Amino acid sequence: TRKAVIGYYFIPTNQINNYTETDTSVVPFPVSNITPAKAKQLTHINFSFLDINSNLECAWDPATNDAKARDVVNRLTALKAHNPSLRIMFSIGGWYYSNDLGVSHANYVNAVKTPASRAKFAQSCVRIMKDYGFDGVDINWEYPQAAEVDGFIAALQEIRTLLNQQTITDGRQALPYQLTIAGAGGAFFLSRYYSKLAQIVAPLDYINLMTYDLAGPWEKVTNHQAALFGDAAGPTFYNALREANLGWSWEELTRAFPSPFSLTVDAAVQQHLMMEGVPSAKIVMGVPFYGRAFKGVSGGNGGQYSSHSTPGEDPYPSTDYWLVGCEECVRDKDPRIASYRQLEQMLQGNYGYQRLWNDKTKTPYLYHAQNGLFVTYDDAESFKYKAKYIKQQQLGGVMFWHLGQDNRNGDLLAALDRYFNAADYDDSQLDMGTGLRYTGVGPGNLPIMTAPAYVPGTTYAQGALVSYQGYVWQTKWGYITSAPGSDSAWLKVGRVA
Amino acid sequence: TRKAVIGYYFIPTNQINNYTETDTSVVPFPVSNITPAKAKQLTHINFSFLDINSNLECAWDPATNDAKARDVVNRLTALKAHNPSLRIMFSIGGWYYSNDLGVSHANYVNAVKTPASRAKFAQSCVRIMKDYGFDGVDINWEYPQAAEVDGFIAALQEIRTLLNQQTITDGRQALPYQLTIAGAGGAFFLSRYYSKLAQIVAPLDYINLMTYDLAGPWEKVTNHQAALFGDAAGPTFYNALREANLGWSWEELTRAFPSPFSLTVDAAVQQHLMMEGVPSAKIVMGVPFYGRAFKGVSGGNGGQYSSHSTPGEDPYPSTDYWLVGCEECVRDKDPRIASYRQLEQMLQGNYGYQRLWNDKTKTPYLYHAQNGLFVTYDDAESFKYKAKYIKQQQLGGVMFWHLGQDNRNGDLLAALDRYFNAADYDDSQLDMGTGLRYTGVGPGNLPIMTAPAYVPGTTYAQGALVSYQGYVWQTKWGYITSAPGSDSAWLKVGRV
Ligand SMILES: CC(=O)N[C@H]1[C@H](O[C@H]2[C@@H](O)[C@@H](NC(C)=O)[C@H](O[C@H]3[C@H](O)[C@H]4N=C(N(C)C)O[C@H]4[C@@H]3CO)O[C@@H]2CO)O[C@H](CO)[C@@H](O)[C@H]1O
Ligand SMILES: CC(=O)N[C@H]1[C@H](O[C@H]2[C@@H](O)[C@@H](NC(C)=O)[C@H](O[C@H]3[C@H](O)[C@H]4N=C(N(C)C)O[C@H]4[C@@H]3CO)O[C@@H]2CO)O[C@H](CO)[C@@H](O)[C@H]1O
């Protein structure tokens, strides 16, 4: 099966209202940058972002010029003429609109509350999709928590029912309308809805994991924002999944959730695969087309895992633009983030940046010894390891944020398409390295094990292993006269073949 | 409120059938040993043991000569003439009858299975109570498994209903009929029903904790069977409670159940106090009137914490009675147990035993250097700290197993009564020591705290404290944007 290549395409309202394809100071990355050849490299383009309004319906930001909106969307859907497999989805949400303290947060929470609100919201999603010519719906609420998850799931199931009927109604069986969501790529946010992952994923074609932003100025130690595997020398974190309402024992939680652990791409993927009912084919690994920068880093380790003096507030509080060579940063007024396109230019501008590589995390980083800067980002080389990981783990594909941050020639997208589809690219001998792998084992991903059947009336010693009722069990202490599963003395450690 | 002093009184069937108050070799401790002065020192005498028969009703052992039984029981209830607050309860169960592999085990499991079996069993408890003249019911099932707990609870609720009805019917408002159970005094067995403690305790006047047998031949290292507090030099144990079906988070479980931990009396009491709805006034601390003996011990620490060669099998697998001076051990064919009465007699027979004291656990023990023997037991001195502990923790009182093992002078019972009631006994200066205390914190014992009220819309860093819905919470990590109870980043750490 072809690996999905899902590229989000972010275009702010101000840009939609002044859309032009001949002035990069107004629209840095117009749709015209995507040629028929680049259109062929993508399976999905997710237009970002639509929102949920106070009427609790899917809608464009009110400030959007509707005619300019349709026009930008038409330029994207026209790309389908060059790729019969391409879908132009729209994404609802994003950090600014839907974070807990976001401008439209209450609308997300309220829309999923009842059967009536869910039906009215779902219907608006299908109406917007058909009105503008989209091919599916992507939900990017960052993020529903505990009490809101059941509504969220029911909202997804209702959208799924409406889209499936729409597919039949429009005779779109060859290219069915799709539903996806962008999910947390780190344990802290993932802990909010983790216990119900199987239900959340059931109605989706894919869950796009935001496996990046695992590092940033809001953290005290500099680190790679999307390390594939862990580096023992890098910082580790409390595993928040241990606090999810799973109703598992202390032994089960401890075994399933190693802690502290390395916040990596592999960790997020394995955490999703751990849960029974979450198919690998639906998991899509996100990669960033931008980097995050830190200033004030100590030397010696290329700036990795160092204390720093980077403001962590949003918006950027200063007028001081300290990321050398980043003119995009001055225009956008934030020296802490830069598109790959700009970072590649900085590497070309002979500014004193050393492009370094961590062979454990399999990711590049920039170090500016002279000024004490550190930049974590991804490139065509780190993408080789992530693409092989994707094939090896049988994931559904790759997703990236966002199309508009690739360089002018679209090399990052081209690289991804190449790793999955080029006849002349061969990664059979690519060495995945010795970086740290995440190996939590829970009640949902138990290995096959072999042990003598349990014998009623027998007394067992601590550590004894018996098979009973489909599982292999182990005693946590001595003199067990209870049957496996009838009391807290036995730990479920394996499955019977 | 006077502290309860609950003395279990065990009289095996052969002794009832051959009851005599004139022949110590037949009935070592007949009722006549309980003089009026001793009767005034007890609040309850729990006659042991009755059982549950195949008809799934409470009943005396079949081999019991009923007339002799009523005679023994009548002497007990006659004692009430000397103490108007005294209750003569009967206990159903015991290790032999009710343990998982015990002879009547199935009857316990089946009696609590259905509403009909539960009504029939409950009704039989009250009938036996009124028929033989008892003042209450004590259930000592060791122990209901997790799956059998809901039936156990309904059974207790049903007996409670019928006993309160009988109390009104019999005009016993002054001395209401009571219902109690003897509960596990260690985390391994306690973990079977720990999650439903509150429901198990609601229908009871008291839960009598068997906070003893925490050490014995079945363990690889000799240890005190009833240490009040822990000794860092002794063995430690896996805290089975962290595996109970509580539905709590890793943080909550870890803070409530440190592991490994010291298996002590204080640990069992605190473990009970950690659950919401288990009032201290209902918790009764059990103490043993007997010692446990080990052989083949090594020197160095008076026999403590040593490897040993004591058989762990029941019945004792041998006719080798190695407990020097223990004549009673030969009579009962087990040199691994001895009553306080016999231990005392072993001490005055100068057989080479040394009475030592551990000031961490606050308990005595014997050490026989020549034969490499170790004996863990309790006495009037260890009872001073446990009685003070009972007063400090506001527990319901003390319970002991069993009256028939006290000495002829009734020194152990006298000591318990003295510590709670004597006008001339002053323990205000008694030093509880530096032995290890159980540090677990749970729902039932959150410490009083104060903190800024949670503010809707505020982001909190890691470790921030706030008050919300009556409790004080703390964040487990940073950048918290939602409310306590609505975001698992918050840990309920205190209260009002
Ligand atoms: C409408 C608006 O808020 N406009 C802002 C704009 O906000 C952006 C940026 O902060 C994006 N950051 C970067 C590094 O591109 C941010 O990207 C988020 C996105 O919200 C999340 N959703 C996904 N998906 C895969 C669905 O990935 C994450 C990414 C990456 O973290 O999105 C917000 C809007 O929600 O920022 C620009 C520049 O600062 C500003 O001028 C203004 O246009
Ligand atoms: C019917 C029977 O098995 N009779 C045995 C008798 O068994 C006794 C003894 O083993 C008791 N042990 C000691 C040290 O006294 C044992 O006491 C148990 C009791 O079952 C549990 N219940 C409580 N409560 C407070 C309710 O405490 C524990 C105690 C202490 O572990 O009980 C069994 C019967 O269940 O043993 C004697 C020889 O000692 C033998 O002759 C015979 O009569």
Short mmCIF file of N, CA and C in Angstrom, two decimals, chain B residues 73-137:
data_model
loop_
_atom_site.label_atom_id
_atom_site.label_comp_id
_atom_site.label_asym_id
_atom_site.label_seq_id
_atom_site.Cartn_x
_atom_site.Cartn_y
_atom_site.Cartn_z
N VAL B 73 -20.70 -22.14 77.84
CA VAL B 73 -21.18 -20.82 77.48
C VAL B 73 -21.93 -20.13 78.61
N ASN B 74 -22.72 -20.90 79.37
CA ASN B 74 -23.47 -20.32 80.47
C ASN B 74 -22.56 -19.79 81.55
N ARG B 75 -21.44 -20.46 81.79
CA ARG B 75 -20.51 -19.97 82.79
C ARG B 75 -19.97 -18.62 82.30
N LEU B 76 -19.76 -18.50 80.99
CA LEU B 76 -19.27 -17.25 80.43
C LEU B 76 -20.30 -16.14 80.59
N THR B 77 -21.54 -16.36 80.16
CA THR B 77 -22.56 -15.31 80.32
C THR B 77 -22.87 -14.99 81.78
N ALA B 78 -22.61 -15.95 82.68
CA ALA B 78 -22.84 -15.74 84.11
C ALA B 78 -21.88 -14.66 84.61
N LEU B 79 -20.76 -14.50 83.91
CA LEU B 79 -19.75 -13.52 84.30
C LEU B 79 -20.31 -12.11 84.20
N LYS B 80 -21.31 -11.93 83.34
CA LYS B 80 -21.92 -10.62 83.16
C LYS B 80 -22.53 -10.09 84.45
N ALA B 81 -22.74 -10.99 85.42
CA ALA B 81 -23.26 -10.59 86.72
C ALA B 81 -22.26 -9.62 87.38
N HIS B 82 -20.98 -9.80 87.07
CA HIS B 82 -19.89 -8.99 87.65
C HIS B 82 -19.52 -7.75 86.84
N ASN B 83 -19.94 -7.71 85.58
CA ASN B 83 -19.60 -6.58 84.74
C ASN B 83 -20.77 -6.33 83.80
N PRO B 84 -21.58 -5.31 84.10
CA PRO B 84 -22.76 -4.93 83.31
C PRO B 84 -22.45 -4.41 81.91
N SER B 85 -21.18 -4.21 81.60
CA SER B 85 -20.83 -3.75 80.27
C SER B 85 -20.24 -4.91 79.46
N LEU B 86 -20.03 -6.05 80.11
CA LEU B 86 -19.42 -7.20 79.42
C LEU B 86 -20.33 -7.88 78.39
N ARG B 87 -19.77 -8.16 77.22
CA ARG B 87 -20.53 -8.88 76.20
C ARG B 87 -19.83 -10.19 75.90
N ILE B 88 -20.60 -11.28 75.78
CA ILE B 88 -20.02 -12.56 75.42
C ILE B 88 -20.39 -12.80 73.94
N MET B 89 -19.44 -12.60 73.04
CA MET B 89 -19.72 -12.80 71.63
C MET B 89 -19.27 -14.18 71.28
N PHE B 90 -19.59 -14.61 70.07
CA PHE B 90 -19.09 -15.87 69.58
C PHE B 90 -18.48 -15.51 68.23
N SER B 91 -17.42 -16.22 67.87
CA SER B 91 -16.73 -15.99 66.63
C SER B 91 -16.91 -17.19 65.69
N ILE B 92 -17.20 -16.90 64.43
CA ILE B 92 -17.40 -17.94 63.42
C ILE B 92 -16.17 -18.00 62.49
N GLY B 93 -15.51 -19.15 62.42
CA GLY B 93 -14.39 -19.23 61.51
C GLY B 93 -13.10 -19.71 62.11
N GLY B 94 -12.06 -18.90 61.97
CA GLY B 94 -10.75 -19.29 62.47
C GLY B 94 -9.96 -19.85 61.31
N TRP B 95 -8.64 -19.93 61.46
CA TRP B 95 -7.82 -20.42 60.37
C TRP B 95 -8.17 -21.84 59.93
N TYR B 96 -8.26 -22.78 60.87
CA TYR B 96 -8.57 -24.16 60.51
C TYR B 96 -9.85 -24.35 59.68
N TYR B 97 -10.94 -23.73 60.11
CA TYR B 97 -12.20 -23.89 59.38
C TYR B 97 -12.32 -23.12 58.07
N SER B 98 -11.89 -21.87 58.08
CA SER B 98 -12.06 -20.97 56.93
C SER B 98 -10.93 -20.64 55.96
N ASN B 99 -9.71 -21.09 56.21
CA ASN B 99 -8.64 -20.75 55.27
C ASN B 99 -8.92 -21.40 53.91
N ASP B 100 -8.35 -20.81 52.86
CA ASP B 100 -8.55 -21.26 51.48
C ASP B 100 -8.55 -22.75 51.25
N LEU B 101 -7.74 -23.46 52.00
CA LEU B 101 -7.65 -24.90 51.85
C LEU B 101 -8.20 -25.59 53.08
N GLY B 102 -8.99 -24.85 53.86
CA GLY B 102 -9.56 -25.38 55.08
C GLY B 102 -10.78 -26.26 54.87
N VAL B 103 -11.06 -27.11 55.86
CA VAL B 103 -12.17 -28.07 55.82
C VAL B 103 -13.59 -27.56 55.57
N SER B 104 -13.86 -26.30 55.91
CA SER B 104 -15.21 -25.77 55.72
C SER B 104 -15.21 -24.61 54.75
N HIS B 105 -14.06 -24.36 54.14
CA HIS B 105 -13.95 -23.23 53.24
C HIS B 105 -15.12 -23.02 52.30
N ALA B 106 -15.51 -24.08 51.59
CA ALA B 106 -16.62 -23.99 50.65
C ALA B 106 -17.91 -23.47 51.28
N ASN B 107 -18.18 -23.86 52.53
CA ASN B 107 -19.40 -23.40 53.19
C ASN B 107 -19.42 -21.89 53.35
N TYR B 108 -18.25 -21.28 53.60
CA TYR B 108 -18.15 -19.81 53.75
C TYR B 108 -18.41 -19.17 52.39
N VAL B 109 -17.77 -19.72 51.36
CA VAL B 109 -17.95 -19.20 50.01
C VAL B 109 -19.43 -19.29 49.56
N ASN B 110 -20.07 -20.40 49.87
CA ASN B 110 -21.45 -20.58 49.42
C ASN B 110 -22.51 -19.85 50.25
N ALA B 111 -22.27 -19.73 51.56
CA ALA B 111 -23.23 -19.05 52.43
C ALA B 111 -23.45 -17.58 52.03
N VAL B 112 -22.42 -16.93 51.49
CA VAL B 112 -22.56 -15.52 51.10
C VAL B 112 -22.85 -15.29 49.62
N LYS B 113 -23.05 -16.36 48.85
CA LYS B 113 -23.26 -16.21 47.40
C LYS B 113 -24.54 -15.53 46.89
N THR B 114 -25.69 -15.88 47.46
CA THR B 114 -26.97 -15.30 47.02
C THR B 114 -27.79 -14.63 48.11
N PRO B 115 -28.80 -13.82 47.71
CA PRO B 115 -29.66 -13.15 48.68
C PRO B 115 -30.31 -14.19 49.60
N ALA B 116 -30.72 -15.32 49.02
CA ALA B 116 -31.34 -16.40 49.80
C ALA B 116 -30.34 -17.06 50.76
N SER B 117 -29.14 -17.39 50.28
CA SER B 117 -28.15 -18.01 51.15
C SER B 117 -27.71 -17.01 52.22
N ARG B 118 -27.61 -15.73 51.85
CA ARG B 118 -27.21 -14.68 52.79
C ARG B 118 -28.27 -14.44 53.86
N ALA B 119 -29.54 -14.54 53.48
CA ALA B 119 -30.63 -14.36 54.44
C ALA B 119 -30.65 -15.57 55.36
N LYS B 120 -30.53 -16.76 54.78
CA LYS B 120 -30.54 -17.99 55.58
C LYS B 120 -29.35 -18.01 56.57
N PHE B 121 -28.16 -17.64 56.10
CA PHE B 121 -26.99 -17.60 56.97
C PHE B 121 -27.14 -16.56 58.10
N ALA B 122 -27.49 -15.33 57.74
CA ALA B 122 -27.70 -14.22 58.70
C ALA B 122 -28.72 -14.62 59.77
N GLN B 123 -29.84 -15.16 59.33
CA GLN B 123 -30.88 -15.62 60.25
C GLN B 123 -30.29 -16.68 61.17
N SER B 124 -29.44 -17.56 60.65
CA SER B 124 -28.87 -18.59 61.52
C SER B 124 -27.90 -17.99 62.54
N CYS B 125 -27.22 -16.90 62.19
CA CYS B 125 -26.29 -16.25 63.13
C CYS B 125 -27.05 -15.72 64.35
N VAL B 126 -28.13 -15.00 64.07
CA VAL B 126 -28.97 -14.44 65.12
C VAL B 126 -29.63 -15.56 65.95
N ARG B 127 -30.09 -16.63 65.29
CA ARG B 127 -30.74 -17.72 66.03
C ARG B 127 -29.76 -18.32 67.01
N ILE B 128 -28.56 -18.62 66.54
CA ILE B 128 -27.55 -19.20 67.42
C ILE B 128 -27.22 -18.20 68.56
N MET B 129 -27.14 -16.91 68.23
CA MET B 129 -26.85 -15.88 69.23
C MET B 129 -27.88 -15.95 70.37
N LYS B 130 -29.16 -15.82 70.01
CA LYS B 130 -30.26 -15.85 70.99
C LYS B 130 -30.42 -17.20 71.68
N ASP B 131 -30.14 -18.28 70.95
CA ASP B 131 -30.29 -19.63 71.50
C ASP B 131 -29.31 -20.00 72.60
N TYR B 132 -28.05 -19.63 72.40
CA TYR B 132 -27.02 -19.95 73.36
C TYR B 132 -26.78 -18.82 74.35
N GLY B 133 -27.40 -17.67 74.10
CA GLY B 133 -27.24 -16.53 74.99
C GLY B 133 -26.08 -15.55 74.72
N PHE B 134 -25.56 -15.51 73.49
CA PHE B 134 -24.46 -14.58 73.16
C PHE B 134 -24.95 -13.13 72.98
N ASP B 135 -24.02 -12.18 73.00
CA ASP B 135 -24.38 -10.77 72.90
C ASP B 135 -24.02 -10.14 71.58
N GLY B 136 -23.45 -10.94 70.68
CA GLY B 136 -23.10 -10.43 69.38
C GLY B 136 -22.44 -11.50 68.53
N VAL B 137 -22.15 -11.12 67.29
CA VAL B 137 -21.55 -11.98 66.27
C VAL B 137 -20.20 -11.43 65.75
#
